[PDB]
Structures are given as C-alpha cells and as structure tokens.
Amino acid sequence: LGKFSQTCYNSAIQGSVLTSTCERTNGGYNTSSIDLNSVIENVDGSLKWQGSNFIETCRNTQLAGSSELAAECKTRAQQFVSTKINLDDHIANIDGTLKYE
C-alpha cells in the first residue's frame, strides 16, 4: 500500500505539492506531481490522512441520548493494489528440489 519512494527518485515538497521521478511498469522514468492538500489535514497539531465526507459513506445518522451523533459508517473502500514479495526469503534449492526453510 503506497510504497512510492521505493520506485521513485528526486523527490521534493513545494508548499503542498510533492514532485518525484517514478519508474514505469515496463522501463523508463516519468516525472509527476500530486497536491497533498486534499488528502492530508491538521488534526490537533498532528498531520494525518483525512477521512471521508460522512454523509456519503455512512447510513442511518441519528441522535442518541442528548448529545451523541450515531451512524453505521463504512471502512476504507476495497480496491486492487500492486504488491511484491521476495521468494528468496524462504524458498531454497535443496539438491535440485525446491522447498521452504
């Protein structure tokens, strides 16, 4: 999840904009930018990843008791993500034969 710095070089943050040179899936490199102002927020003096508008991602909003907002809210949306794992870590050649160690 994420993991851009592993495949990108020459990164800089100018104001609220991140710029980097990232590898392509089949070779070459591409310089590109992304404004982080729409995904990061200031919560109590601590930078954080911001959530969703709750009226689009929750159901049955209601008052509970005297002062409580209650809802059934949705978790992070499900998506497909590229990932990799080094098979050298635990797969071995043991007399011509592959096994786990």
Residues 17-76 that bind its own copies (CB under 8 A): 18, 20, 22-25, 27-30, 32-34, 36-37, 39-55, 57-59, 61-64, 66-76
**CB 36 to its own copies: min, Å:** 6
Supply the minimum distance, in Å, between the C-beta of residue 95 and its own copies: 5
Nearest distance, CB of residue 64 and its own copies, angstroms: 6
Closest to 22 measured CA to CA, from 86, 88, 82: 82
Closest CA relative to residue 13, chosen from 47, 43, 51: 47
Euclidean distance between CA atoms 2 and 79, whole angstroms: 13
Q: State the CB neighbour count (10 A cutoff) for residue 21.
A: 13
C-alpha to C-alpha distance for 28 and 39, rounded to whole angstroms: 28
